[model samples]
Target: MGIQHEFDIIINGDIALRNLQLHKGDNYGCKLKIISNDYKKLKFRFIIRPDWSEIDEVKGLTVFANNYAVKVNKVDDTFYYVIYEAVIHLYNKKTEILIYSDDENELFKHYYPYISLNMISKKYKVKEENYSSPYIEHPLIPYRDYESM
Candidate 1:
């Protein structure tokens, strides 16, 4: 429900790419400026991996952006993410992609394929509980709907 998963391709270069490492709060990189077709831009600031999650879901994935902590137990064949909602603001291309899961157990069934689709399929340890969820009960999103920004 928060603004996390939004993808804007047209301005992908100037906005997302230019500010690639901005998430770390170091301005050494180009700061993210949400610009619309009209050239209206808004300056923004960000903090690097602040320990925000204290009582909420501590799933490793919630800790950082771009880096996900996917825990596997049994090798999977394919990963499935249920896209439920997405939005794109006019000025900035900040992402807000939300994936709702009906079966929390199945929601994290990513990184499957004990073997990689690539020529080299390596065998690795699978942490099933790594994909376990106690915060969101099964039947997530409550709706089988899919949307885009």
Candidate 2:
């Protein structure tokens, strides 16, 4: 699916907090717990929330490693929660291109790149202005309606 490959997110400049609460009736946060290709090293990054609150690592771990393998969620037709996992990458912004085998594990060589792609590649389908006003919420999408399919 085109949606599968073109995973990118456009955060709103106004309220583009990474760990946004979207009326889900729960306090929420998300982060990326990246594992070295060798599965030896682990690292995490999350949305920069308001009041300098920490990004909830547990929510991110659950969402990325389990709940978000396929798609992200739109909350109350407002905010969104998303995650991305990249199997192939071109390394980072400063470094030149590098590729890793689907099964290779070289720790520092690919860890950051994978995490970068994993987080940044997630995209929002609908613009925030289209939904309401310029106060953009987190980028999230509604899951496909299988009954119609």
* Residues 25-66, model 1: lDDT tens digits: 111111111212442322211111212223232111121111
RMSD of 1: 18.6
Model 2, span 25-98: residue lDDT tens? 12232222221232221222123122223333313212234222422332211124233222222223222112
Steric clash count of candidate 1: 16
TM-scores of the models, in the order given: 0.16, 0.18
Cα displacement (angstroms), candidate 2, residue 47, comes to 1.5
Q: List the residue pairs that clash in candidate 2.
A: 7-121, 8-122, 8-123, 9-122, 9-123, 18-47
Best model number under lDDT: 2
Q: Best-fitting candidate, measured by TM-score?
A: 2
Predicted structure 1, TM vs. truth: 0.16
lDDT, candidate 2, at 56: 34
Off by over 4 Å in 1: 1-33, 39-79, 91-149
